[PDB]
Design a protein around this nucleic acid. Structure first.
Ligand SMILES: [Mg+2]
Lengths: 120, 110, 117, 56
RNA sequence: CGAAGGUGUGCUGUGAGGCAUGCUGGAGGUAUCAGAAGUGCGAAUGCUGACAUAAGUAACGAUAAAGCGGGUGAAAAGCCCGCUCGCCGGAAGACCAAGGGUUCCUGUCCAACGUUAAUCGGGGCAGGGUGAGUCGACCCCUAAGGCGAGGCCGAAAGGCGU
RNA sequence: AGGACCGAACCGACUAAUGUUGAAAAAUUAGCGGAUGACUUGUGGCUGGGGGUGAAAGGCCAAUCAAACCGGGAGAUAGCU
RNA sequence: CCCGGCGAGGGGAGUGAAAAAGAACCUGAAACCGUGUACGUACAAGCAGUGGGAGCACGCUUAGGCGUGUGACUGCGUACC
RNA sequence: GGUUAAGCGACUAAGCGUACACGGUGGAUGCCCUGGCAGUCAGAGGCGAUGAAGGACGUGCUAAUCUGCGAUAAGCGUCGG
């Protein structure tokens, strides 16, 4: 009954959870701005920030391991080149969450999530 | 002087709208509008629209004093209902009820 | 000729509801319960029209017994002395005197005591 | 399981005492535009902590 | 200058009731005396219509699965576009018969419907759309079978049958 | 060659669970038997109620059957409620 | 004319004897659902009434202990066909 | 006047109950009928192969319906009011 346990269920099984985490993380790293629910972004952090930390070091093995996630060559290409130097001098906290109210369709807690600076 | 505005045959249950009407009964309009616009209910949006219509009615048809304007009487009355048939198991039919509501807001400076 | 009962029945229902205005919930709103409530209230009123005399007699006798007991005599001895003294004061006036006029009840009590001997 | 007697309106309204909604009182006050917004939330135009957060 | 009716008050009678009046109502009602009832409701698991109850509870209809950016739109988890993830793929694909009878396309809208949002739709309104010597139907013929002049039988109706 | 075997389409429902105001006025899921024949299916026709049909349960005859449905006798009758 | 979504709906002005006649349109009761006023209720048990009854608010009256509205408590009281 | 101790103690209604006033769904009651029911006085007591009763389809400046009519198609010719 959840004693020192982590990992939300999101009303999905492991395969769907992993797939939609992967799609969400790819969309975020592509766009640098995503609006979604609070738990979804909170669980996104634990996938994207380690991905950024892995991308901080550029190597063929590191690039292959990164490609094992997000299943996208363009996503990895954007990594190790753009977000690497930007977050090279940053130790964690690459993403931040800004609440923006609730949806009008299902009344779900909405929040924007973005990077630190976004170069904008 | 008293200003009266209302919405008739609104597609919402009387109890649901009454649950929101009691939140702004007797409160200041300036804060009542803020409460209505930040309440996560469809009936809240409906009563916000009715209150805005009443507020506009209290300036285009009335003289002045919008700041001290205060809501006095608010009540929701059940309206005509629609009879629909919802099929059920074993060939049984249940007459389902869709309830409409009349939302009336009474506002005056005093 | 066809006769419509929509006026006489309505008048009777209004009269019945008037007779049972304000008991509780459906009893003051539903005719089918209002009629039974009216009948029960009438029966209770008929019974209490006789019960009230007994209750007031009990109150008067309790007060008279208390008043005699402050004077140092029981109710039975007080009544025996009053009867032996040819005194025919009803217990309502006796209780009123005892409540309001102390000296009058004292005088009654020594007269009863003297009549006892 | 089904009822044996009809509950009164007193029971219905007596059950609904705890069903009353709660109303916010002190949402927030913006330090730049001075508009009401939810606590730890951005405003309508994406303002939080004075600086723009959404850039439209 | 206010009829019936409705809604309150007061008075009155052993009672079914009666009288007066406030308000609404806005046009018929009717004294006394006689006569005729479709003449008096609380029940009949009575019938019709309306409204409570459970209760704002279950449920929202196969555990194949959604997410992101942009656009219309007052409002987008559900509409459109693009990127992904997943499913069927001797089907959840395509073409027909039977049946349905315009559900097909376009423009327009959310009165009612879709078990929610709705701008969407097999929803409402208007317009358009179906081109055959070679397709099918039609037509020639025929089985099972149906009708059946004359004929036989049977009260009639009618049955069988060339 | 088999009224042969295993086993798909197809036919049927023997076992267990769910359901019992359900998705369904008998279904779904996991299993099951037959599966070239006494097989199944499409189309059209025939057998009409004291009758039809029936590898026979007195089963079915339009979600019903120890005598279908519709109208009439008929406001049948009820010593019953 | 205004709000509202170039809706629905509402409020003004006006016609209208009347819009408390607005197309859901004559008169508009009850069951049912609300708002405000007055009273009581968070230590009290049951066909929820009846008799007594302090108290609380208003009209009286120009005092005169009156009436209306509620009923702290108390004796009795286990619906109708 | 203050400190301490004891006793008494309403003013609170999240909601509810009672009476009143104001409202909503609800469409009974009151009034009315180019609608029915039963009779009286008279006619007619049948239509049709010279194509009946009854229907389909078309007919307007017509998108639909009712009614009339039938490619001469909400109709035409003659004679009367
Ligand atoms: Mg009442």
């Amino acid at each position: 009954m959840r004693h020192r346990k982590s990992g939300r269920q999101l009303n999905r099984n492991s395969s769907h959870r992993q797939a939609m985490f992967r799609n969400m993380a790819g969309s975020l790293v592509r766009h640098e701005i995503i609006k979604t629910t609070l738990p979804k972004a909170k669980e996104l952090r634990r996938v994207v920030e380690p991905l950024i930390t892995l991308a901080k070091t550029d190597s063929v093995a590191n690039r292959r391991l990164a490609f094992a996630r997000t299943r996208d060559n363009e996503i990895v290409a954007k990594l190790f080149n753009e977000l690497g130097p930007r977050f090279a001098s940053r130790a964690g906290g690459y993403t931040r969450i800004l609440k923006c109210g609730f949806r009008a369709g299902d009344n779900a807690p909405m929040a924007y999530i973005e990077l630190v600076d976004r170069s904008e | 002087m008293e200003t009266i505005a209302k919405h008739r045959h609104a597609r919402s249950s009387a109890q649901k709208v009454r649950l929101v009407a009691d939140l702004i009964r007797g409160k200041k309009v300036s804060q009542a509008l803020d409460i209505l616009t930040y309440t996560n209910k469809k009936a809240a949006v409906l009563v916000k629209k009715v209150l805005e219509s009443a507020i506009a009615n209290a300036e285009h048809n009335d003289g002045a004093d919008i700041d001290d304007l205060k809501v006095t009487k608010i009540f929701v009355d059940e309206g005509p209902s629609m009879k629909r048939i919802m099929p059920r198991a074993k060939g049984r039919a249940d007459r389902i009820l869709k309830r409409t509501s009349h939302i009336t807001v009474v506002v005056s400076d005093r | 000729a066809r006769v419509k009962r929509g006026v006489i029945a309505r008048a009777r229902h209004k009269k019945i509801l008037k007779q049972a205005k304000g008991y509780y919930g459906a009893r003051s709103r539903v005719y089918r319960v209002a009629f039974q409530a009216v009948i029960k209230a009438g029966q209770y009123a008929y019974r209490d029209r006789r019960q009230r005399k007994r209750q007031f007699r009990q109150l008067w006798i309790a007060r008279i017994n208390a008043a005699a007991r402050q004077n140092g005599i029981s109710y039975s001895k007080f009544i025996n002395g009053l009867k032996k003294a040819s005194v025919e004061i009803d217990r309502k006036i006796l209780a009123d005197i005892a409540v309001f006029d102390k000296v009058a009840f004292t005088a009654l009590v020594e007269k009863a005591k003297a009549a006892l001997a | 399981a089904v009822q044996q007697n009809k509950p009164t309106r007193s029971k219905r309204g007596m059950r609904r005492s705890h069903d009353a909604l709660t109303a916010v009182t002190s949402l927030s006050v913006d330090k730049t535009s001075g508009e009401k917004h939810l606590r730890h939330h951005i405003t309508a135009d994406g303002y939080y902590r004075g600086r723009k957060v959404i850039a439209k």
